Amino acid sequence: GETKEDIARKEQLKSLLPPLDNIINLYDFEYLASQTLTKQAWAYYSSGANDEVTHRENHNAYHRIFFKPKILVDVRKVDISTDMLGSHVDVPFYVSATGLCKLGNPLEGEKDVARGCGQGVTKVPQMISTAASCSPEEIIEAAPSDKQIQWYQLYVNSDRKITDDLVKNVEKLGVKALFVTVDAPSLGQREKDMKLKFSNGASRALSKFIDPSLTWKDIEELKKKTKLPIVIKGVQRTEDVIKAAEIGVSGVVLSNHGGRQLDFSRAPIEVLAETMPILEQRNLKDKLEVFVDGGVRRGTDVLKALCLGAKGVGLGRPFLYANSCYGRNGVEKAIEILRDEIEMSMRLLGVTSIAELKPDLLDLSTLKARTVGVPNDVLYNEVYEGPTLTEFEDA
Amino acid sequence: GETKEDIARKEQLKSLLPPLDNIINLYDFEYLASQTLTKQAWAYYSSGANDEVTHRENHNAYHRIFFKPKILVDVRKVDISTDMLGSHVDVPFYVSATGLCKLGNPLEGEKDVARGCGQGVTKVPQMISTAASCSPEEIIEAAPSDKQIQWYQLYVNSDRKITDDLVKNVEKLGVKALFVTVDAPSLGQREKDMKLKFALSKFIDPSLTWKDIEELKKKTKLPIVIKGVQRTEDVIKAAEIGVSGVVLSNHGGRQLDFSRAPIEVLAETMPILEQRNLKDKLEVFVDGGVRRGTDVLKALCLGAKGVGLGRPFLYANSCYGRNGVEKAIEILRDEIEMSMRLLGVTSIAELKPDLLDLSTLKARTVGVPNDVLYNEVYEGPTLTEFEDA
Amino acid sequence: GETKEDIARKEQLKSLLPPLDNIINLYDFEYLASQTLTKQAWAYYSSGANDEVTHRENHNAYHRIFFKPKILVDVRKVDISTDMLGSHVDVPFYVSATGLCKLGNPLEGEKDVARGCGQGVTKVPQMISTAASCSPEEIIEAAPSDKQIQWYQLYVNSDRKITDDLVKNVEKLGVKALFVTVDAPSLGQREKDMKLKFSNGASRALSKFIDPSLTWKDIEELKKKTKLPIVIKGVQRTEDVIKAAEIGVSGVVLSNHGGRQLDFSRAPIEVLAETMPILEQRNLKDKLEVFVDGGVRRGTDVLKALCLGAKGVGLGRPFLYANSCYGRNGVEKAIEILRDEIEMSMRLLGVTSIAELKPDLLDLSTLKARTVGVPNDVLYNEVYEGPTLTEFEDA
Amino acid sequence: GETKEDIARKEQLKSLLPPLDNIINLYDFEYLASQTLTKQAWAYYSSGANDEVTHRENHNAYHRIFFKPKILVDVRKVDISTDMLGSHVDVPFYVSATGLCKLGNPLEGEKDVARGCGQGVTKVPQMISTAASCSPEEIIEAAPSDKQIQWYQLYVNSDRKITDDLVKNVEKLGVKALFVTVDAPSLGQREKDMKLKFALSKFIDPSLTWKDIEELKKKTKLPIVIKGVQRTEDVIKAAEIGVSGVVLSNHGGRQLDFSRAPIEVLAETMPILEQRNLKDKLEVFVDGGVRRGTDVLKALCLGAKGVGLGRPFLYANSCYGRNGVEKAIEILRDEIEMSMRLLGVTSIAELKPDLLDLSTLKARTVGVPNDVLYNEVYEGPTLTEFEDA
Ligand SMILES: Cc1cc2nc3c(=O)[nH]c(=O)nc-3n(C[C@H](O)[C@H](O)[C@H](O)COP(=O)(O)O)c2cc1C
């Protein structure tokens, strides 16, 4: 629904976009993108399912957790590197799979995220999406480091030959893990997107591309057909984390697809807080790597998830916005913004490595204070007049 | 008010209404209805009692419930059909009784509800209101399908002769059940209606007792549902005198304000029915504030046999008549199937409490008043801006 | 700080004021008063202490309580009469003591509230204030019924002779109880009022008029010097309700002076909920009458307090606003609005008398959910764009 | 930015500022300061870390505490004096350290804080900032009274020679104690300041350990308070190595975001100190978000020996210099006395936990996101209107 007004945005893009060095936090990329993207690019990237409560709750649940920082600790040197899925990693976060990057970066798309992830002094793992505009071969050869790690996000097709070919193709090209997405058997209804087509059933949200019949048995079979570590992406309850351990897969992403699938799925941060203790109650902790994603925007968020026992934390939208505004250098800047935020807050937390981030650094006593207020009294509040500040004379 | 202004309205409902197929959810219907209906049609439909807290809490309480969905389950095929009141049904929801449809749909009224409820693939039960603009016979025959099911809602009269006639007369016309409304012995004060205009009715007997329901059990073979229960103790009472069902309801927040959300009463009473083997003896329905497939699913996971919707169907009808009603049914049907799949179950019988996170069901909060001064002077963080220009 | 603009309000007063019959609820009187009163009349009536949180919390705490209504009960006849302090009363509410009614009703002041309280088919008890513009003799003789009950609100003076004379004078004139106010040894700082003087220490909030040295011993002494039932007004904790019972006084008003004294005093409705069970845990329930006030605006509020065991519930501001807009008939209308609201809701509750209003009609499980949210994430919420409703075509 | 626009500012601070005696509370000072200060003065004073949640939570958490006041107590006479760090004090609060006062008060800076702190009836302790525009000697002598007490806040340098000099040098000048800041090994990111401009310091040693505090105990006879403790475990640690006190503080929300409100840490640690006989061994101070006499009282009721305020004094100083500072002291002193009387106690020693309702101290909530659609379409009740015109 673009208007030649298309040009109002070209003016904004026109380095009315502020210098990259002036970007303070991940929210800046978001704001800029919101003003410069195509109506449809913005609809597709930013939308969630139905009323979008899970989308927002993903982020807000981090705020039910506070810190218990150690003071008078030697925090001169801080190290934020760790290991994920057998690789050594510079950073405890990763770029999550996201479709259609050419909507925001027409010229380079996902190749610019491979570049941003691997060009600088700090490299970040990249999860390549099945719904990528570019091909896996294009994205992998765009990688500027032999050391940078690239994972593959898989939808199993109803036609399992296509998936068999795809898995073989991507191990050849050297991706280091498979993330099988299990939270989208049906396509989430993203109403901002639809509003735009309509003026601008049910089995229609099914597709041969994403097999709705996918089953625990299929993952067990996939496991035999590849030497790649497999991670189940989109786990939303502890019972399924346990099942994942039982079939001996490598990991799990506690994720609700960025609030794009089931609304009123819980914040993965609280699923995490419940899951990890239960894993340690049966020796399973060090045998399944547990990742988390959704609503992560600050280093303190990353830190909260790590203290609860996540191996790593993924971000989707923030890298899309960075890429959509500044391409490969936007991605790298986003990486630096986040790396620095993690470093800062570790010092202030009083720890010096990722292994030192533990549950007793957190105040978890209000983790369950997820509340819905009684509706307010509109008449009472309407007639009520609040206090006032003294005014200035005005001469 | 109604000021000849109302051609601005007639322009709105003109071809200016968007194509039916552009309607995405039930709130769209509500929005459109709010701009096109008469002040008095709007006030009467949208109204609740006094401060309207129960009205809104009916809905918001669904948001105290979250999902624990199963993944890696074959969900290619899903069935949302179920039984209600001895008869088989396509969906696990229904149209609740809801007076005076002719204010919003003048030519057709609640005849168009009947039409919408059966003119398409999915056939949805209709509760006929005592307060309906059309007569029960006028509605029952406008129904395009004989597969479609119709229920009757009854206020018992102070003159019990009239009620005995009306019961026998609806039995005749083919209604498959009788819903007895018990939450309106006196009609609730709906202040939006009153402000525009500028409590005991003969229609409704305030003396209605349990014994009178025991009476009605013998005088009819239609199954009786007590519509308007608001505490567990009375759900139990309905079982003891052996009626068929019960709607956990507070009349869409139109009667007693600070009545609890039925979803919250549901969550309290089902475990109690279980601890008593009564969960089969009594069918427990629920209405109020239902606007999304996930609302319906929450209710069904808790033990509800079926869930009612009032206002959403009124608004769809007010805007697009029978078609709107059909479309509303479609929207809601799809929302349930899609969310069923993501939940990881394939039949209504598989919707159980273990699919739900009920740990924050009781987080019904009232904040301490905000610090007006502290908030006024405080200046929030700001986004990076865009250059010069 | 009035501007001749004084006349903008005279125009509004000019039966631009809608007919009395068009007043639906107590909030209407409030709104009307807010537009028609003198800046100072509005400041004095409507203000609370400091940040006014207790003032607002008084009302909101009612909303932490829901109902558990009985259905299929014979509710044809409903009776809302009861007894207070030895008198039989038409109604379970009363008009609380309020100063300076001539600010809002220049011609008649408090005499119009005596009239409104006693003229109609439904009479309401009236608590006469020490800070009344009119004299107790004027207010008592304005009473249109021999049956209407009038109480007296007392501040004990530092000069106890004045108080001794006053108590003797008011028993002579036939008031039926003494309410001794104990929550104002120092004057609450009401900043809306002050803003208005300033542009328009500490011992300055002390006054010989209200003795700060008032003590439990003084009430015991007052008790001997009068045959009038004495009620302690301004009790804010259970421990003082127990002390009141111990000295054998007749009652207590759980009250914080309408949020005009200590800020962060609790809502009397929750003090009530805690106090009553503790009274029954030591036989004291039927030996001390417990009144409650502050933030009562609806009949469901009155009902909530009665179910918890209050003998009666007082309203201040709502009668001031009614009197300030419509004088004696405003008061009577307010009385009818509230009587009707109580009657309606009793039917719907499924009870038929005041004695039938009991704790098990209430859902008290969230009574303690008095919460303060973590501050919200202004950046997150700012960039976030919510869902949208479909628009209309616009031709 | 700073755009010659700033004569609009100079007009504001002109006789346009209201008479000092019209200032009612501490927020008035803040408001006035917000309109008159330079963008950079404002950003630097008003700033917090990252999202500024801790900044605001410092204050809002006081609102999770309510009072259980005693009535019928003789409160004619009230005393708010107390001891802090071995010396007797007029009030139970103090001015906390707070860099660069010359941005807001150019001619006088933190000399005017000293003046305000002692130029009138009430004499309030001053913490001198390492980051002060004026030198410690320049401040210590501008103090109009020798009764008034001054403390020093210290960042220990990586070059420990400089710290040894500075300590000996402040001991000399007469500071009655030493506040060691431990919550800023790396300086917090204050984004308002940064947005206007468009993390390890030599000033501050990130390697500071407990052992180093043990070291400083021997090398000085001034009592040491560890300023910037944020968990109970470290309060205990401070007692064990035997320092004098501890400020429960998170640097006014300027360092680690999602550090808890000190008032909430206070409520957790005092009962623990009691269960260990340590409550006398250690003096526990508290700062952050304090704007009202009742905030101060809540803190004192919980066990705090004294409570600090940063920003309110900066803003009073920025607007009215030493006079503002005196007036701020007055406002706060009166607020405490008045609320003491209504609380029903007459000395600081009588402020105890039983005066507090602590039952909702843990009600630190985050609401589920609001239902945007449901709220947009919903229309609230309306007030009766006023006739024609
Ligand atoms: C634009 C968009 C497209 C996405 N496409 C996919 C996809 O194809 N496969 C997948 O497994 N996840 C997909 N995701 C979800 C993520 O990998 C991730 O769960 C989400 O972005 C985490 O949330 P956040 O964006 O709030 O950080 C997508 C997310 C977005 C926002």
Ligand SMILES: Cc1cc2nc3c(=O)[nH]c(=O)nc-3n(C[C@H](O)[C@H](O)[C@H](O)COP(=O)(O)O)c2cc1C
């Ligand atoms: C305009 C209107 C009229 C209604 N009339 C009746 C009635 O006559 N009898 C009855 O039992 N319920 C009546 N109801 C209430 C419902 O049957 C139903 O309980 C309610 O609409 C459920 O709430 P919801 O509108 O939020 O879906 C009415 C509701 C509305 C909105």
Ligand SMILES: Cc1cc2nc3c(=O)[nH]c(=O)nc-3n(C[C@H](O)[C@H](O)[C@H](O)COP(=O)(O)O)c2cc1C
């Ligand atoms: C304008 C005003 C003046 C008052 N004057 C007195 C008084 O002199 N004595 C007293 O005991 N209470 C006095 N009160 C308080 C009440 O009697 C009562 O506690 C309060 O009005 C209850 O709260 P509400 O106004 O929210 O209903 C006054 C209240 C107001 C609003």
Ligand SMILES: Cc1cc2nc3c(=O)[nH]c(=O)nc-3n(C[C@H](O)[C@H](O)[C@H](O)COP(=O)(O)O)c2cc1C
């Ligand atoms: C502008 C500014 C500068 C500050 N500089 C310091 C400092 O150098 N050292 C220190 O220990 N605290 C410093 N503080 C923090 C305080 O001493 C105090 O902990 C804080 O201001 C308490 O919070 P409040 O401002 O909400 O009262 C500073 C605070 C502000 C606002």
